[PDB]
Structures are given as structure tokens and as C-alpha cells.
Ligand binder design. Sequence first.
Ligand code: NA
Ligand code: NA
Ligand code: NA
Ligand code: NA
Lengths: 408, 204
Amino acid sequence: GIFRDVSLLHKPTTQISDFHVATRFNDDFSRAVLEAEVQMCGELRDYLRVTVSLWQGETQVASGTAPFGGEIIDERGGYADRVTLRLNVENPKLWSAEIPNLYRAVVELHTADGTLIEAEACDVGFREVRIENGLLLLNGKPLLIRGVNRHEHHPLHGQVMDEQTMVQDILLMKQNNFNAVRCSHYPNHPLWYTLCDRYGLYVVDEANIETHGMVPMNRLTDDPRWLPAMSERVTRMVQRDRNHPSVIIWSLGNESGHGANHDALYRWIKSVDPSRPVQYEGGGADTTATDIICPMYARVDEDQPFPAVPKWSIKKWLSLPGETRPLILCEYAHAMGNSLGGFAKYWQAFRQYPRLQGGFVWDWVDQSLIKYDENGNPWSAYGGDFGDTPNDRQFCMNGLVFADRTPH
Amino acid sequence: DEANIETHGMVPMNRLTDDPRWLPAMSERVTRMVQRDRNHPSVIIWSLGNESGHGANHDALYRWIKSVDPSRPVQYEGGGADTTATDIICPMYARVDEDQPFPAVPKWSIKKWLSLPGETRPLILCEYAHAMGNSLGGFAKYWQAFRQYPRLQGGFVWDWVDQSLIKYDENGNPWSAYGGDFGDTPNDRQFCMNGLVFADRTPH
Ligand code: NA
Ligand code: NA
Ligand code: NA
Ligand code: NA
């Protein structure tokens, strides 16, 4: 169904069509350069101008104005319908899940005399994400991911999300010492990223690609005829969400094996947005299509040597010959019912090994739905309770909290 | 095959090995060993000595060996067992699971050591499982780890045979003696007996 919002937007004929925000820093993060690239559609005129202003609350920190026309990029010239403005910020307040400092950037399309054609805005978080010497760093410091996987689920409204439920989830997660969320397994409602920017949570943004039921799992992802469809799902997500500071990692999807399309899209992301690592678990969790070893349900000490996709113990995985990447479990500690035995073992290992930088619990909230018996009394239902067949019964309930967000 | 260089008693341990005035003496002990033994097939690894800290002389002699005999790896434990003067992480008495974070020369657990950022070398303990008396508790843990981790390629037990000496009482009856039994002082008593076999080669 139509399970997210529907709206009408009116733009002028000459309009802002895209804008990108990037932050660069010096070695000690005491100086930052805010680079904003703005793109337009419509008739170009010599009087057109673009102004980008950066605000910290009520105070304007930086500003820049320029006519359209980018730098030369190849033999034929540059983009006449683009402009890049670079704003210097001294001693910027850095964004993190601990302290989510935010600035407000306003992008103005206006004529030279001063009349405003159109304005767009976005929240700006100054932070640098990079993998150096096998460690994932945020603002120069190695992260320890206290993560959880979260589906968009409501026991009454199905997969329709609301701001109140989102805020309730974020507050509960932070109150229970979580600092990261994986959008399993699709781009979320747009307000989710804004709330994560505001409250402080690292976000893994995941493409809407999962072909788990295929035999073999990469039958489609290794087929060039499905490359366009896969590419749309990756590229449109990046184009929508690349400005959000909370998003620190891109994911190519979930449980789709490993095919050449994964490698192609990994490289596309690395080319378009070098500011964020790319991860993907399929094909054994350490393929060429991931910057992070991200296995699902690899155990702390016990090896699980399956054919062609083994789940080594996470301690052993780090030291395999020629392996240097960090390891962050994209799913672990399956919380189905009376569960989470052995969680302390994982966290002992996370604290002992530098390149074990945490993981994402599976998962946040039970996917139970509400039904009414013969007396209007509600009761929580799972797979098979709606006449659906074949079904997977109670495997939909793997959460740390009940569907009404009461804790397990 | 190990060079005859050990300066364990120095304070700090590299006081001589970091002094260029002792480089000739150290170089003689390395180079003459290599010149004598480089034809033996059984020799697969050279060692620069034992427990002498880490000084520039170690790096110089490591490179000399690498230049003259590229056919054998070079190892050295001093200075924390993972310095620039060794091709193999070769700690002494690093434990399987427990870290021992001493200042400037920590003994990480061997499993953790392999995965330290930027570390790629194999790990072979030059000494482990100290067999002093009723000992070798926990040996199975080491060998479980050795079999599970590819880059944990074993180690050298300390050590083979007790260093006890024979003395005779008032009736010509022999008895095994250790440190201090010859009037030697100061001494380190029974720490000379760390072997898997007695001095007469009967097994423990
Ligand atoms: Na860690
Ligand atoms: Na499930
Ligand atoms: Na091994
Ligand atoms: Na001894």
C-alpha cells in the first residue's frame, strides 16, 4: 500500500535541483572547510547568484556568494549550471553520538540585486569518518559500536511510522546505552535521519536489496540484467541521504550472496561519496565489496566452518593471513524470546581487541501484530495467525522490546 | 641457531646493545656464527641472541644477516618481541588468553597479538610453558590455540633438561644440587632446574 507520506511540492522554473555538503578538517580538527556544491535547473542568467550561509543557533558563522559556473574538469570545460562555495569555520563544534553538535546551512538562490528565488536548508554536523590502519575512526578516535538493528514496525499500523514512535525508540535506545542503529534492511522514513542527527546515534544506511530466497543466493546479484534495478536502489538512496551527519556507513543490502553487481555498486559509492565507508555481509562477510568485516552471528570463540562461507570466530577472523580490516558484526546476539545468553562474552572480546569495534544486536522490537478474539480483547500475533501459509511462526519476534515498546 | 649475546643483567637491558662502541663485539658473535653454520640444512632460523633489550646494533646485525643469507628468517625477542629486528613475533611466556600489559614491553595474549593494527607476521613463542618442577599446567590451552589459529605456528618449551649438578655427601652417595649448593653467593637456588627431563635424562 501507500505506507509513507504523499505530498505536493511547488518549485519555480529556475530552481535549486541538488546540493551537497562536505566537511574537511586539518590534523587536529581545529580548522574546517565546509564545501557546498549547488546545482540548478532552468534558464541560466548572468545575474543569478547562490549564497550559502552557516548558522550556529542564532549566530551566522560563515557565508559565501558566487555566480554559477564551476571549475574546469575536462577538455570540454566545466559545469555552467553548478557552483561550489567553500566556507572556513574556525574551531568547529564537532558532531558525535555523545555530543550531537549541529549547524544550520541555508542555500539561497537569488539574483544579483538581492531578490530571493528559492531557499533550501539542511542540518550540518561537522565530523570525519575514516578507516585508518584497520580501525574505524570518528573525528580521529576509534569507535566502539553499541548497535542494534531496527525494523520500521508498529503493532497497529504495520509498517507506517510516526514521529512519536521514532522518538520513543530513540530515547529508549539511548537510555539503554546504544549509540548506533542499522536500518535493516532498507532506507528509512526521512524523519528518522533528522531525529538521529538531533539526538545522536550513528546510522548505517542500507539499500533495499535482499534476495535471500534465491538459489544460489547470488543468482540475481551476479546477473548483469539485474544491475540496473540494483543500481537504482543504491544510487537513489545515496542521492537522498548523503547530507545527513548521522549516516556514517553505507550498506549495499542484506543476504544477497556476492555477485559482480555488488562490486560495481561498492565502487560507485566509493567514487561518489568517499566520506563514508561501505559495508556488505553477503558472500562470507569479507569480500571485495566491503570495507569492514561484518559477519552475522559469528561466535566469539567457536568456529563454524561452513563450505565456502565459513563463520570463523571473530577473534580468529581478525588474524587470518592478509586480513587487516576492522570487524563489526552487522547482526549478533539474536534476541528471540528468552535469549541473549553469552552477551558478556561478546563485550569482553570487544573491549579486549582493538579491531573488534562492536556490532548490531538483532534486533530492537518484536514484529508482532495485534488481533482481537471474540470479546474485542487484543492479543499479540505472529506468523501463521492470519491464515498466511507457508509461514515462519514466531521467528518474527526477535526484539529487545515488545511491540508496544515495553522492555524484555 | 642463536648468537652468543645476552646482556640480561644490564640496566636498562639495552645499555650495551644500543652503544656503537659494542657493535664490533656483537657483530663478531653474529657474523662468525653465520659463517660457521650457514651450510647446515637443519638450521632454518637465525636468532640475534637473548634478552638484550632492543638497540640499533640489533637492527644493524638483523640487516647484515638478511643481506648475507636471505634463505633463512631472522628472529629476536628483545625489546618486546615485535621490533624491527625480527621477522617473527617471538615472545617469551605470553599467555593464550590473558594480557600482561607491562610498560613499554607488554606481553599481549598471543591471540590478541596477531590482530594488532598493522601486524602481519607469524607468531612463534621462543619460550613458553616453563617446566619448573611440577609444572606444565595449561599446556593443552596453548596447543588448542596453535591448531585453531593459522598464524600461531607453535613455540619452544622452556626447557629440555634440568641444569642440576652432582655432589657427594659423607658416604660417596651422589645427590643432585642446584644454586647455592657450592657456596656460590648470591645465587638463584632451584631456578636452574626447568627441564622436561632430569639431568640424567630420565623424564618428568
Ligand atoms: Na575493540
Ligand atoms: Na526473524
Ligand atoms: Na596454527
Ligand atoms: Na632458569
